[PDB]
Amino acid sequence: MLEAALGLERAHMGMFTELAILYSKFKPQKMREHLELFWSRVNIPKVLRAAEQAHLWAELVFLYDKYEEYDNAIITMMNHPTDAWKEGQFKDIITKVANVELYYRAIQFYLEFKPLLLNDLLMVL
Amino acid sequence: XXXXXXXXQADRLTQEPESIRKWREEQRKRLQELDAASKVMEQEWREKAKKDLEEWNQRQ
C-alpha cells in the first residue's frame, strides 16, 4: 500500500521508515533496494533495532556508513565477512574513525589471514 | 455517546505466535555465515600457508 502513498504529493518521513520495519525481518533482497534510494527521508536509531533485528549486514552496514558511524559499519565486516564486505569497500571507512584500536584487530581479518592486498591495506593508513 | 466516548488481544494466536514464523525461518536464515566462515576460512588461510611456503622455496 505504502507502495503508492509515498508517491503522493503529500509524502512524509514516517512512511519510508515504517516501510523498512517490513523490508527488515521479512523481505531481505529488496530491503537494500529501498535504503540506497530513501536514506535522507527516514529515521536511523530506531531502524537499527529493526536492522540488528534483521542482520541484513549488506544494507545494515551502509546505514552506519552514511550515518557516519564507521566504527560500527567497519565492525559489520568482522563477524559478517561474506555478507557486506567489499574488498576496498572496507578501505574507505576506517580512515574516518577516531579509535585506532579497531585497525590492529582489523589487520587480523586481513593481515591475520588476508595476504596479498592486506599490504595495500597498509597504504592509506 | 457512551460507546465511543466510554471507550475513549481478543484471540492471541495467529495474532501473536505468527511471530514465531518470521522468527522461525530467520534463525535458519541465521545459520550460514558463521559455519560458512571457518569452512571457507579453512581452505583459504591454509592456501595462504602454502603461498608463503612456495615463497620460501623459489626464493631459496
UniProtKB/Swiss-Prot annotation, chain A:
The subcellular localization recorded is: Cytoplasmic vesicle membrane; Membrane, Coated pit; Melanosome; Cytoplasm, Cytoskeleton, Spindle
CHCR repeat ranges, renumbered to this chain? 1-119
Record's subunit section: Clathrin triskelions, composed of 3 heavy chains and 3 light chains, are the basic subunits of the clathrin coat. In the presence of light chains, hub assembly is influenced by both the pH and the concentration of calcium. Interacts with HIP1. Interacts with DENND1A, DENND1B and DENND1C. Interacts with OCRL. Interacts with ERBB2. Interacts with FKBP6. Interacts with CKAP5 and TACC3 forming the TACC3/ch-TOG/clathrin complex located at spindle inter-microtubules bridges; the complex implicates clathrin triskelions; TACC3 and CLTC are proposed to form a composite microtubule interaction surface.
Q: What is known of its domains?
A: The C-terminal third of the heavy chains forms the hub of the triskelion. This region contains the trimerization domain and the light-chain binding domain involved in the assembly of the clathrin lattice. The N-terminal seven-bladed beta-propeller is formed by WD40-like repeats, and projects inward from the polyhedral outer clathrin coat. It constitutes a major protein-protein interaction node.
Give the protein's biological function.
Clathrin is the major protein of the polyhedral coat of coated pits and vesicles. Two different adapter protein complexes link the clathrin lattice either to the plasma membrane or to the trans-Golgi network. Acts as a component of the TACC3/ch-TOG/clathrin complex proposed to contribute to stabilization of kinetochore fibers of the mitotic spindle by acting as inter-microtubule bridge. The TACC3/ch-TOG/clathrin complex is required for the maintenance of kinetochore fiber tension. Plays a role in early autophagosome formation.
Give the family, as the similarity comment puts it: Belongs to the clathrin heavy chain family.
The identity of this protein, by name, is Clathrin heavy chain 1
Organism annotation: Bos taurus (Bovine)
GN (gene name): CLTC
Q: Which residues of the whole protein are included?
A: 1302 to 1426 of 1675
From Swiss-Prot, chain B:
Q: Which family does it belong to?
A: Belongs to the clathrin light chain family.
Q: What is this protein called?
A: Clathrin light chain B
- What organism does the record attribute this protein to? Bos taurus (Bovine)
Protein's cellular compartments:
Cytoplasmic vesicle membrane; Membrane, Coated pit
Residue ranges, annotated region (Involved in binding clathrin heavy chain): 10-60
**Assembly and partners?**
Clathrin coats are formed from molecules containing 3 heavy chains and 3 light chains. Interacts (via N-terminus) with HIP1. Interacts with HIP1R.
So what does this one do?
A: Clathrin is the major protein of the polyhedral coat of coated pits and vesicles.
Q: Complete protein: which residues are present?
A: 91 to 142 of 228
Domain of life, per UniProt, equals Eukaryota
